[PDB]
């Protein structure tokens, strides 16, 4: 999958973060190698938020 929506809202204020509300389309670019953390791009802008926050639109 490559098109995802966010099952939660996450909000920070760090650099390279983004701020995602529950159900809020984004695509997934990347993610740490603990799996942790994802690079979403919405049309807000791109940046990281935890991967458990977003699921499939597949």
Do not use: H
């Amino acid at each position: 999958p490559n098109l995802f929506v966010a099952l939660y809202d996450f909000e920070s204020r760090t650099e390279n973060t983004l701020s995602i509300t529950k159900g809020e389309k984004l695509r997934v670019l990347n993610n740490t190698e603990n799996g942790e953390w994802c690079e979403a791009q919405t049309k807000n802008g791109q940046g990281w938020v935890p991967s458990n926050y977003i699921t499939p639109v597949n």
